[PDB]
Amino acid sequence: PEMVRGQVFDVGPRYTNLSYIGEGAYGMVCSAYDNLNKVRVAIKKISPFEHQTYCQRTLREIKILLRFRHENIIGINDIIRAPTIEQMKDVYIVQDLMETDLYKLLKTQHLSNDHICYFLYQILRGLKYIHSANVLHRDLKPSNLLLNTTCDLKICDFGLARVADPDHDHTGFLTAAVATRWYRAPEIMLNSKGYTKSIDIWSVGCILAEMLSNRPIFPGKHYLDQLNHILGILGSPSQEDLNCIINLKARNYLLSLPHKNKVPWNRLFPNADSKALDLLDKMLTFNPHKRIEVEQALAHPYLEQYYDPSDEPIAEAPFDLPKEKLKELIFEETARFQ
Template identity: 50%
Template structure:
């Protein structure tokens, strides 16, 4: 016998996964399968809009992952920006503890930048400019809230038909004035990692997101990843192969003597010309990428400098580039995860959308 569906709920199956959600939602189709679960499109009959519903099954099996999901829910609940995905609902679990699944409802986006880059769709300089402008506008807002995203890559940038872009997947985000507790483990898919991350520097700043944005920019220009390293040593060699061998001043941030020795033993490389790599690109775009993909994080441009670059002169307007109203409060994050604590925290987040009288 199947369990009866609770009152006020609806049940459907998509991609072999069963969803039980509030009956205001009507299933349309499956959209994707992420690292953490299945995403479907649905109609929200309360607001008459299309939404995305992500089910994270057995969410508490891995407590580190569950803590990441909590972090993402907290951040998305705090953020309010056109270029960051909006959290519309967290389904109220049946009890404070003892449940297994989490359902998160967000804006519905049709595709992501990774799919667009590797599609046959023509990408003009106007497209690239608009995607990069929206990405940097979103990063400006995230940084102004005292948050580093740490995992920017094309598949984490969602798009819809009119080219609106929204940043998602904030589970790896961190505050940048906090203790750097083992910050290296999960940061950024390797191809988009800044040199200071690969070389295990303790110098973690907002500039790691600018490096990732530069890698995304290059991927838009060349329709292929710029630094597809097979392991972290290969990654360093590929970066140096394009940017040239760093001088001793530009290696000052590397606190690890072994990493410095490794670089000094590599054959000396000259910097490649961006025009050679991307002969069809707008030269103004290449001027900007040159400021973003800088080995030394202290010399890499900030997001404010990037937005002010001539490449965005038709789009950039500081008055329409909002900042966060206050810094994000990271104090909640300072706990040793247990299943009971995490289920309780997620329940509290869901209560914000479903107040119980």
């Protein structure tokens, strides 16, 4: 086989010329030359079968990415597994090679308002599709957004995606957790298991702010610190927002806090397009019910020059196990690439 860093990467013969790109996932990601398509591709190696949770995230993701077909969602071009379940140690997900991601890009570049508008548009275009299939991404963040050399954007990492379940959304104060802290909607830390689409919009809202300033807008250092960050900018929620929080621990935590007034975005972002600040405003709304939805976000004037519903597709149809059957389902699900 071939070896990258110091580890076996068994993707011959079609995929050659393996350069190390990074970690994440259940480990290694590499560029490789796809001999059949004569193009370099990304290959991530997964060894998930040791604990159930990785078999779950790997399964969720493969199931979803196979069903999705969208310019702004990453997709899977190939999967390399052993020919028998007994011999299957690893799964190799083959995907398109992308120059960078929004995380790296933000660390080094000032984005123009045109790149911001186009990036945002693409995010929302992709998100519209995902939501229309009734799936939530639940972990949108700049590192989960990949750009190619031509600034084409693709959402990746559906490891934590769930099917939307707004009826089953409620939970107690501080019940936690799992999605990246900085991009978590405030109701995750109060009264939501994050089963509503409004959860993603918040994230996109946080991504938009990060694009305006190259800094995360709510860099809370720990669980509850996140909330005072958010509250610090948006201000104390009103009477009506509070009433929507029936859970007493959460509501009384909010009441115990000192009054903070709203900081206007134009003060936080003096150079930004005012249309962007308006949309920003509607996305980072404390009350998730009052929070804008993806299709109104698309129709917002800030996006006017890209907005075209006939070129913004929706899915043609919508959407607790031992790691044994999981390994077995993964095998069954990866069969079509044998």
